[PDB]
Structure 1
Amino acid sequence: MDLLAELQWRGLVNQTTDEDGLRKLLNEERVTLYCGFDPTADSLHIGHLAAILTMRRFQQAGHRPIALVGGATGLIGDPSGKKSERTLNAKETVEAWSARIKEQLGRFLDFEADGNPAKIKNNYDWIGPLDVITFLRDVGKHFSVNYMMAKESVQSRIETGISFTEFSYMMLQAYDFLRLYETEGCRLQIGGSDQWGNITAGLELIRKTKGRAFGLTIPLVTKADGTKFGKTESGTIWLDKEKTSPYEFYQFWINTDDRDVIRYLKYFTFLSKEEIEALEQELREAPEKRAAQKTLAEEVTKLVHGEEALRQAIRIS
């Protein structure tokens, strides 16, 4: 209602399976929602932040978030938003990386809350022990190849080429939504822009097995210059302070272009509309001051690294 209208205002709603339906439910009950994160490195990056903080916002409005670590799916690989087939990492690598990500994930959510404390879960727990026969019949019977070929993730790759491995990924994620729906009462799955197909596939699986759940995607973070958000000369802006120091993290944000700063305050910050509007006017009236830019950098560095880390960054600068 207001949560959804605020998200909209901020620009965090790219698509929704049924907006009136979802608004309705959000307003009547504590909603269990989840977001998936696959270990494709030993650290999350700012590419994951919008999804992460959106979870947070759902928590603050009294909803229950589950952050899903992709122990199983990180072993297959999501073709979504990828132009090329990816290399398979080893169980050992994925296993190690999952442990870390779980750690960064925990920072942004509340586990002490009573009524809506978060849960962090690993899909290896239920995909790990599943036999192929069970999977091909219990999940696979529900999907036609024609339904799947049409998916943006796949359509985007059959000439380019795609192994059966990645083509099957959507089933796995489809299955995660069903398990979570059943064992945790999860009625909403959220994700970046590229996840629409995987989300709706989970909804198709639910619908077809139960005959009630919704999906929301966050839009791709844009730049006015038309370059790749997070694409620095430095390489990725990690959330691991040993890969990207707090000072570097802080400088990345401080260097936001005047053109982007207001979209970024709305996306990554917990500042009100009224604080954000005010900074817009100050951005207009005194743009050499860089008030919106320092506000962003302080807010986001604090979020990710905390105050002492912030304090260091500022004094180092």
Structure 2
Amino acid sequence: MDLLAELQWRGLVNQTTDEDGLRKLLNEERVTLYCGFDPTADSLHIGHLASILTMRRFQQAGHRPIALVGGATGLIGDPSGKKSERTLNAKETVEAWSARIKEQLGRFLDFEADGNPAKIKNNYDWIGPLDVITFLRDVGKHFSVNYMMAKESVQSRIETGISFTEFSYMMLQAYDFLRLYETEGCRLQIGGSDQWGNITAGLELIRKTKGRAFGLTIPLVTKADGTKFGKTESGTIWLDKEKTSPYEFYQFWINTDDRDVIRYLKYFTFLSKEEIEALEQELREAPEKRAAQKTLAEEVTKLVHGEEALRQAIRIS
């Protein structure tokens, strides 16, 4: 209702399986929602913050978030939003990366709350021990090859090429939703823009096994110049302060172009509408002051690294 209207205002809603059905439910019950994160490196990056902070927003509005670490799926690899087949990482690598990722995820959510404390989960726990036969029969029987081929992630790659490995990824993500739906009463899955297919696959599986649940996607973060959000000359802006220092993190945000600053405040910060609006007027009236930029920089650096880290960043600058 107002949560969803707020996300809309912020521009955090790309698509929704059924807006009125979801608004209703959000408004009538404490909803268990989840977001999955695959270890593709030893650290998350700014590419994951939209999803992370959106979970947080959901939690603040009284819902219960489940952060899913892709221990199993990170061993397969999601073709979604990828133009090329990826290289398979080793079990040891993925296993090691999952542990770190788990740590950074925890920073953004509340574990102390009673009623809606978060949960961090690893899909390795239910996918790890699943036998191929069970998988092909219990999950696979539910999907025709024709439904799967039409998926953006696959459609986008058939000429380019895609192994059966990556083609099947959707089944696993599908399965995650079902399992979470069953064991945790999970009724909503959220994710970036590229996850639509995987999410809807999950819904198809629930529907076909149960005959209820929703999916929401966040839009790709845009730049006025048409370049790739987070594509720096320095390389990736990581959430690990040992890869990307708080100073570098801080600088990154401080250098937001005037064109993007207001979309980024809405996306990445917990400033109200009236605060965000006031900054817009300040942006208009005194753009050399860079008030929108400092506010973004401090807000986001505090979120991710904390005040002390922010304090250093400021004094280093």
For structure 2, the residue ranges without an aligned partner over 5 or more in a row are: none
CA distance in 1, matches of 2:101, 2:300: 18
CA distance in 2, matches of 1:253, 1:224: 15
CA distance in 2, matches of 1:302, 1:70: 27
Aligned residue pairs, count: 317
CA distance in 2, matches of 1:40, 1:15: 25
CA distance in 2, matches of 1:238, 1:48: 10
For residue 248 of structure 1, report the CA deviation from its aligned partner: 0.1
Deviations 1:73-118 (A, max 9, x none): 0000000000000000000000000000000000000000000000
For residue 250 of structure 1, report the CA deviation from its aligned partner: 0.1
CA distance in 2, matches of 1:157, 1:278: 45
Deviations 1:54-88 (A, max 9, x none): 00000000000000000000000000000000000
CA distance in 1, matches of 2:57, 2:65: 10
Deviations 1:249-273 (A, max 9, x none): 0000000000000000000000000
CA distance in 1, matches of 2:27, 2:263: 27
The DSSP-based 3-state class of the residue aligned with 2:120 is strand
Q: Within 5 Å, which residues of 2 pair with 1:173-184?
A: 173-184=173-184
CA distance in 2, matches of 1:211, 1:265: 40
For residue 278 of structure 1, report the CA deviation from its aligned partner: 0.1
Moved over 6 A (4+): none
CA distance in 2, matches of 1:83, 1:253: 28
CA distance in 1, matches of 2:247, 2:231: 17
Structure 1 length as normaliser, TM-score?
1.00
For residue 166 of structure 1, report the CA deviation from its aligned partner: 0.1
Deviations 1:136-183 (A, max 9, x none): 000000000000000000000000000000000000000000000000
- Structure 1 residue 35 corresponds to structure 2 residue 35: yes
CA distance in 2, matches of 1:129, 1:175: 13
The DSSP-based 3-state class of the residue aligned with 2:12 is coil
For structure 1, the residue ranges without an aligned partner over 5 or more in a row are: none
The DSSP-based 3-state class of the residue aligned with 1:88 is coil
The DSSP-based 3-state class of the residue aligned with 1:194 is helix
Structure 2 length as normaliser, TM-score?
1.00
CA distance in 2, matches of 1:309, 1:72: 34
Deviations 1:111-134 (A, max 9, x none): 000000000000000000000000
- Structure 1 residue 124 corresponds to structure 2 residue 127: no
